Amino acid sequence: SHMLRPVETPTREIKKLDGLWAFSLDRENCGIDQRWWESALQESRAIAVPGSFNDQFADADIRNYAGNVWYQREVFIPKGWAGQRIVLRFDAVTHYGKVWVNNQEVMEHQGGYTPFEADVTPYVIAGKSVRITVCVNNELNWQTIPPGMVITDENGKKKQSYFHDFFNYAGIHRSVMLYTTPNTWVDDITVVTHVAQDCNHASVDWQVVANGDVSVELRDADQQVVATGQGTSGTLQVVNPHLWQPGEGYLYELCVTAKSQTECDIYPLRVGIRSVAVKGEQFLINHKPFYFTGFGRHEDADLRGKGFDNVLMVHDHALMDWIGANSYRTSHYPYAEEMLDWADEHGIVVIDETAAVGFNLSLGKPKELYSEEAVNGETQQAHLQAIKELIARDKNHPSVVMWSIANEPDTRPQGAREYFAPLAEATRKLDPTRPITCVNVMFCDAHTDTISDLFDVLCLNRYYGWYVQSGDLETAEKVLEKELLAWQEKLHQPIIITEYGVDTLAGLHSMYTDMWSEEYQCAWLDMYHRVFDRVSAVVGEQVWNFADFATSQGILRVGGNKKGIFTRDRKPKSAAFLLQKRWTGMNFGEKPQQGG
Amino acid sequence: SHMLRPVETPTREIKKLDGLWAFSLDRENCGIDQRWWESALQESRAIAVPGSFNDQFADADIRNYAGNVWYQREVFIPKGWAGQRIVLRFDAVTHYGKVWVNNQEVMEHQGGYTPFEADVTPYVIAGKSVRITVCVNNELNWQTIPPGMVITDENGKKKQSYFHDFFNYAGIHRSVMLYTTPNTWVDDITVVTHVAQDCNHASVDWQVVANGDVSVELRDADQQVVATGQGTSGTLQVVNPHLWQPGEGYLYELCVTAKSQTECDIYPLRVGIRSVAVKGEQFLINHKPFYFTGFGRHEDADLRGKGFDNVLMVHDHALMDWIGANSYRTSHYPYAEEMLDWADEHGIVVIDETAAVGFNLSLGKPKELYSEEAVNGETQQAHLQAIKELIARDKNHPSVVMWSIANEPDTRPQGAREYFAPLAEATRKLDPTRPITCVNVMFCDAHTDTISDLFDVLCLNRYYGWYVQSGDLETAEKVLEKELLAWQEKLHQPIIITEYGVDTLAGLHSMYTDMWSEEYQCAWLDMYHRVFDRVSAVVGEQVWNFADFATSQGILRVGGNKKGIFTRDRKPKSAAFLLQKRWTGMNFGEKPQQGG
């Protein structure tokens, strides 16, 4: 469908992101048979929402649970809600959610990281209390996005195995809410912003107003109307603009009005006037070459598996700001929209990424990745859908300068191309206004990768000197430089190293500057930087990883992934100061001149 | 060469192990060419001996060095040693040494864990200073024990590669001593103990008098002669037994007197009256069921690498005693003989092991492990040769109950059985008195493993739950039991678990009791224990490792190896208390009731 972001004015929100909900596991999978949504959840403990369910109770068995869990909550419809359009929305429900308003199934969703909502007007009475039961599923398979394989052992007990390097946290990770609109309501806006050598431009609009004529006005930061439009559908605005720019992100405001004969609806959409374009080996923003700095991030913290939190967001952005990061990539799933609102407001450049990681069977059972058994026509449709829902969500955020379709598919087999070519094309139809990318795994190098020509920007995840040439900066450096030059000459695209990093145990110090030591982390990033500055095609550097985060258990992960610049409690490792010096020492948004 | 532990009676030694020798790297491999041994090493620096050269200087470039290093030292010969036999002895020089005394090449050795000695009387003048120069080589190859491959880079320098987990520390690891003897002397002995039902029984001497007759009296701990023979070549002695027992380890003393016309050489040996053999599923200590507790250990410590150190030895034994260890294995190389005197004297049980580890290519470039390319006849000789020298050294140490011919060879390839059958043969003949073993890796399991039948005791290194069934105690327990039971069937041989362990970060704590957490170590060690007990065949437990220790760099090793019950600075992890409680809550040398 269509997704607008709930704002208040004529339209109003009840939070119900009030956190305390009833919660129980459904170990027997009785829940649907017995219609638990029909009465109060039995044997139910208190849980916080928004939040992962896994870590809230410090219990291994709830953490490692695979299958169905139930959230239940009673809530009060505002009396004043009367005959307005009432909508129940979930910003996210991890992997799968099915929702009941009082023994009435109102919605269903597969996707752990984007919103789903249903008009509930007919199913609720204003001034009365309703029971809300969500059945949440955390299972992955070959058609889920990201993919996985549940293994049931001989006892019929499920266990989730998956192919990506973060932990499969689940639950209601983001805001759930009740919200209002008039029976005439704006429900889709699409803004495209053009700029022409930065003295003037046009901002096209496209508007869907469920039964309403629309009018448009564009306002300053200091709230004065600078352009108007009728053409309630397709209306183009000309301006002497304050451009939304990486440093500051100046935001205009577009007010969308849906008028019925008796009814009004008012939707304000923040707009940054900026162009994004690749020209040759450059990534241009408002027609200037940009240089990315900053991180691949995760949504991860102690006690919240991936649950959204405002303090964590305020804090992490103070860190990213302090360190001189100008960008990030929503590694491995769409992030909370609050994050993109922040980025828009603060002029943070973002690479927006679907949840399509784990397409790889060689990261470290089926023998063909592209297979009817394993990655197939159904998967591709699920993949396209994931792309659709992400673009439908994030299309108007000026902070998003690029779409990332997938992280680290195995592109060696013939068929990778078969599978990805249509997604690349589809994606571009969905959004013509942004470069497109597919993040690239180390072993699909310049000579073996089959897919990268189909996208606009080259985003490489590189670990030379870590997973390969381990401990050896000297030969690490040679392989890295040779690889990046090969890519440059092969594709003549802008290259962003979207991942480079080494596990570092905070407090592990070594005179020998060897693996897993603060000093090795320092020397290794430093060597990588030396190379980047020698390669003109390199247009960006995003360190892996903002902070330590949880993964599945194994021999390769010491209590988790330790490639953070900060620890999970947001303590700086000495590499944090190193990056601070490089990033705050550069000219903003500008690439070093390959010397101090 | 004939091998006797120098001791002080009518015989004298001056340790040159007084530590400060002059040291140099020969990066240019000029050393031999220019007879560096003829003049003071230039570009020299002070180094301590006994100790690894690698970590003494906090320099990576020295730590990772492969090739020849030069040790030089001047020493005033004592005036009272003038027409006496003078012997220069190195208890160990890691990998290879070439020794000169003032431009006089005196000795050469391959094998980093056993002594080598030569008479220097002709090349040295008593009351004068002579210059000692040593060429130490750390390079390993296929002919070497343990094996390795050395690669010369595209730039021209050497880098070592090897297949055993611990770090390749090299240098002069054990003491060097000048050594005195009469012109007629003892250079060999051998003793055997027979004890039938702990009634009085006999000790057969066999000796080598280098031109003398011997009187050979046995003394009690009170120097009270309780038996005598004059047959300097073969005897027997019989009295009410007084057993060398694992509890306290009582010893007798055998004066070996060797007579010439002008000179008498009294050599003293220590003797522990005890019996070791297998009956079916049981390892019997003096005809009585023993159950092993204690560790796989290494020679590794903070700044000395594998260099011997008395304080470290005193301290480690305090800890093993405290924790209830009765046994350990000289992991993957033979230890400093001081360790074996301690075990003899305190009655500790020792599974003695050669340096033959890393025969395997699957632990984590040649096609066939046993082949001209990889392991060949030549390699089988050195293996033999290494086994010769060990038994030559430790044959008389009562604490040694059993030989471990090697650690973790891959027996799946073709020829594995052909390789080990003859070496098994040669060893049984070399010491008929002690049982013999080969320590077995996880992936050569009961059904897959060849070559388990040629050995008397089954020594298993098992990791279920940690490398496989990663983090899963429940399945790991079943696999382990079925595995161990499957082992009682194929053979009804005594089973000792020589390694069972999990990497654990001191200070990593988890409510989820997951991998690399102090808790997990406890839970996992606990789990092996419940299984261990149920198997009648299980004669012992030896935890991997005693303490954290260095390894070559890689993504699987964080500090180095972290499976230590103690950290490298000897601080206990919570699992030290788990073991303490079991190993002292037992009856000594006995098995638990397969229940409390």
Ligand SMILES: O=C(O)[C@H]1NC(=O)[C@H](O)[C@@H](O)[C@@H]1O
């Ligand atoms: O293994 C890593 O450290 C990271 N490398 C990658 O290439 C992946 O894109 C990341 O998910 C992963 O966390």
Ligand SMILES: O=C(O)[C@H]1NC(=O)[C@H](O)[C@@H](O)[C@@H]1O
């Ligand atoms: O990897 C380990 O935890 C240990 N397991 C083994 O089987 C080896 O005998 C040891 O060297 C090694 O350190």
